Amino acid sequence: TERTLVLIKPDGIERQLIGEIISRIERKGLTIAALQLRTVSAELASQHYAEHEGFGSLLEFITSGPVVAAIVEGTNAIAAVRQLAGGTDPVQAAAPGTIRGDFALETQFNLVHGSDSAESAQREIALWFPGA
Amino acid sequence: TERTLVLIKPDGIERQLIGEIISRIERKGLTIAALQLRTVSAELASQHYAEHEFGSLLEFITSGPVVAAIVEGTNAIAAVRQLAGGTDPVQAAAPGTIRGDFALETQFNLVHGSDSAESAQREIALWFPGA
Amino acid sequence: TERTLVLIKPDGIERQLIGEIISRIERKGLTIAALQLRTVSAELASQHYAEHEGKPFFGSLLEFITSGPVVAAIVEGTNAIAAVRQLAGGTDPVQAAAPGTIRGDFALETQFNLVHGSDSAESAQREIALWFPGA
Amino acid sequence: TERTLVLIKPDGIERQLIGEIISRIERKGLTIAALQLRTVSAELASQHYAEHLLEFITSGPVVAAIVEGTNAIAAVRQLAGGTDPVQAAAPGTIRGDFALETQFNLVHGSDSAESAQREIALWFPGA
Amino acid sequence: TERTLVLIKPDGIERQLIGEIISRIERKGLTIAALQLRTVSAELASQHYAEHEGKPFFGSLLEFITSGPVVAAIVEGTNAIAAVRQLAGGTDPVQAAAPGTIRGDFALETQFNLVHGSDSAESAQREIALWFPGA
Amino acid sequence: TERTLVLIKPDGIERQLIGEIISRIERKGLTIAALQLRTVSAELASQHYAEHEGKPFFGSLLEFITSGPVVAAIVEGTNAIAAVRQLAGGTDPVQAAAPGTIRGDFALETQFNLVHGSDSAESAQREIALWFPGA
């Protein structure tokens, strides 16, 4: 079954939105296959954002506090999670009714991430949940 | 007053979304003029999906109970379509709609609202003759 | 499997709480086995409320339930009868109904308390036979 | 910090949507800097409506608020949705979720920094 | 019609619960007759809390209510006073307040218990005259 | 600060209530200090439920907790232990749990009652040491 990696970033945790974000995923019909609150090392951090090198503040913010990582599974999971999350700019791009559209104001603090493609999902799941 | 037919499909019932879907209709300012849980016969299925003349739609609509409703209010036809969302829950339906919030694939997209005044008249006459 | 009768009274409909009430039943883990919006005749009203004929509030009960459409449902599941009574809350929405129940969250007066669920196995059998005679 | 004026119109109050609208503003991460239920005079109404109504805003009480936060002006417009609740407003907005027609579309937020300044001075002079 | 005073305390505001609390009141079927976000003066804090004069936590109550803005409201409707008390929950959010109440759902300690509703007809009349003189 | 162990049981996961449960904890004002979806070994189950060993329903508790994944969490905050027990509701979801609690709102039978919170300071310390031995 199709799987994607979801991260609730440190701002999502600080705003007490862990449950809200997971609920939205569940009500969409997707399942949580793996789930863990964790701290992010600079090492893990630079690997996650490797496709950004040419980027430096994403390493810093993702390490500023705990995140929640999840494997999300179900039909069309990758695109479904992107749809739920919304566009990168929470006010200019993200649609009302999305996580970013309902809950966020700025790109730098946009709460969540979902893998952007089958290839990204594969890489990110291997990085965050190696052995899954 | 303007009226439309709403169908909560078998997947909507199986996923315990009857209340959620009706609430969204009510909160939009529309009223429930008629409402019934029922089984769907083969002949009714083909009349409902006459424009789509297809085998999967007919097969699925008869696989379990559905909830049929007449929904009434200003701009009710277009309002129900807005609430339900586009046909593909992921590719077309907007976030904030029934399909966009709750569904993953077209074959299992939970709900139907009449697409036009002509369709509403036909579908209401079909599902609630005498209404 | 255990079944009970649920009625959404005319005030429940007028206040656009049909969905909210059905959602609470569904989230509790119960299933909707039958469901219909309908008008209540005096004959139906008098039978449904027969156990109250000797009570001073009997009259108003009959006309209120006939004042507008209601939604009737068969609700099914483990402990369905007690579970529905728990969800609905006590008769007086402020003095008896707990916070978190339908009456506790949405209502103010006994005469406008939104919903009814059968009060026992015996009442459930009776009320289901009355409202849904082929069920 | 950026601020904007929010009005919950008489239909918003009549439909018991005060809390729902405030919550949506709060969940977005914006703060309520000022808040007041009041009646609207014709002289006030006419000031509020000059660029663009006058009959409805005076038909019942409204709730006025100052809403503050990063990108507050555009964020409130996004939350509220387009003017026509069915033709323009997105699902997920206040108008898209709760309204049917333009004349009864529940809520208003300032449309620009200039409008916000003018409207706040009008509804909350001294703020 | 029956009227009561509701205060959303500074912690209610700081935790972005203004909308949540007002929604709970509205869905109960009550109406918001007056509503104002405001700062609280020392003289006002003492008057509001007059009946707590002999309690060891008297100062603390006053010091907290002045620490930030509050929302005051006049809430109106049938059984409004008791209904608001029901919605709000008991004073200790964990030991007393029922689940499904504002305090039960959202708060952990008495000193930060989010909201207040008048506790009687006499209290509502005094508190309304205090917070909204002319209402 | 006070910490407690929370378990979302296999029925809680199967019914897609992970988010709902975590949300109720967060809105109460409590923080999630640790969180993990995991499978439960027989050795773990017998240790977790050791106090029930003499009870008729002991076997059934053990079987069910190993029947599918669970979510384990450390929950932290003022009065966290009592607060979580309040949020969860009494053991029997219909006979004991209050409306407005996780069990009262979402469950029907004791055997499928969705969630667990440590019942005391002693139990919380033991349960945390068991489920999260580095915390």
CSV table of C-alpha atoms in Angstrom, one decimal, chain A residues 18-19 22 35-38 68, chain F residues 2-9 13 17-26 30-40 44 48 65 69-77 80-81 84-85 87 102 114-119 123-135:
chain,number,residue,atom,x,y,z
A,18,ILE,CA,-0.4,17.2,17.3
A,19,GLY,CA,-3.9,15.8,17.7
A,22,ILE,CA,-3.4,13.4,13.1
A,35,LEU,CA,4.4,7.3,14.9
A,36,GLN,CA,7.1,8.8,17.2
A,37,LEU,CA,8.0,12.0,19.0
A,38,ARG,CA,11.7,12.7,18.6
A,68,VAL,CA,6.6,14.1,15.5
F,2,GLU,CA,3.9,15.6,37.1
F,3,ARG,CA,3.9,12.9,34.5
F,4,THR,CA,1.6,10.0,33.6
F,5,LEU,CA,1.5,7.1,31.2
F,6,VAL,CA,-1.2,7.1,28.5
F,7,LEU,CA,-2.0,4.1,26.2
F,8,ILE,CA,-4.2,4.2,23.2
F,9,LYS,CA,-5.3,0.6,23.0
F,13,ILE,CA,-6.2,2.8,16.7
F,17,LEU,CA,-9.2,8.0,17.3
F,18,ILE,CA,-5.5,8.6,17.8
F,19,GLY,CA,-5.8,12.3,16.9
F,20,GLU,CA,-9.1,12.8,18.8
F,21,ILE,CA,-7.5,11.4,22.0
F,22,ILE,CA,-4.3,13.3,21.7
F,23,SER,CA,-6.3,16.5,21.0
F,24,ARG,CA,-8.4,16.1,24.2
F,25,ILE,CA,-5.1,15.8,26.2
F,26,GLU,CA,-3.6,18.8,24.5
F,30,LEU,CA,-1.2,19.0,29.1
F,31,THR,CA,1.9,18.3,27.0
F,32,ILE,CA,3.0,15.1,25.1
F,33,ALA,CA,6.5,14.4,26.5
F,34,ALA,CA,6.9,11.1,24.6
F,35,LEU,CA,4.9,9.2,22.0
F,36,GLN,CA,5.3,6.0,20.1
F,37,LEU,CA,3.2,3.6,18.1
F,38,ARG,CA,4.4,0.0,19.0
F,39,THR,CA,3.5,-3.6,19.2
F,40,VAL,CA,3.1,-5.1,22.7
F,44,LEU,CA,5.1,-6.4,28.5
F,48,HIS,CA,1.5,-3.8,32.5
F,65,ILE,CA,-3.4,-5.5,24.2
F,69,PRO,CA,-0.5,-1.9,17.7
F,70,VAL,CA,-1.0,0.6,20.5
F,71,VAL,CA,0.1,4.1,21.0
F,72,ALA,CA,2.1,4.8,24.2
F,73,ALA,CA,2.6,8.4,25.5
F,74,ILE,CA,4.1,10.2,28.4
F,75,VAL,CA,1.8,13.0,29.3
F,76,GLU,CA,3.1,15.9,31.5
F,77,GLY,CA,1.6,18.9,33.3
F,80,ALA,CA,-1.5,15.4,34.9
F,81,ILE,CA,-2.4,12.1,36.5
F,84,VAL,CA,-5.9,12.2,32.4
F,85,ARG,CA,-8.1,10.0,34.4
F,87,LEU,CA,-10.4,13.0,30.5
F,102,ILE,CA,-13.2,9.6,25.9
F,114,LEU,CA,-10.1,2.7,23.9
F,115,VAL,CA,-7.5,4.3,26.3
F,116,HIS,CA,-5.7,3.9,29.7
F,117,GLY,CA,-4.2,6.5,32.0
F,118,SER,CA,-2.1,5.7,35.1
F,119,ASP,CA,-4.3,5.6,38.2
F,123,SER,CA,1.4,3.5,39.1
F,124,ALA,CA,2.5,6.3,36.8
F,125,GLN,CA,6.1,5.9,37.9
F,126,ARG,CA,6.0,2.2,37.5
F,127,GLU,CA,4.2,2.3,34.1
F,128,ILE,CA,6.5,5.0,32.7
F,129,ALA,CA,9.6,2.9,33.8
F,130,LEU,CA,8.0,-0.1,32.1
F,131,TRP,CA,7.0,1.5,28.8
F,132,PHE,CA,9.7,4.2,28.5
F,133,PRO,CA,12.8,3.0,30.5
F,134,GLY,CA,15.0,6.0,29.6
F,135,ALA,CA,12.5,8.7,30.2
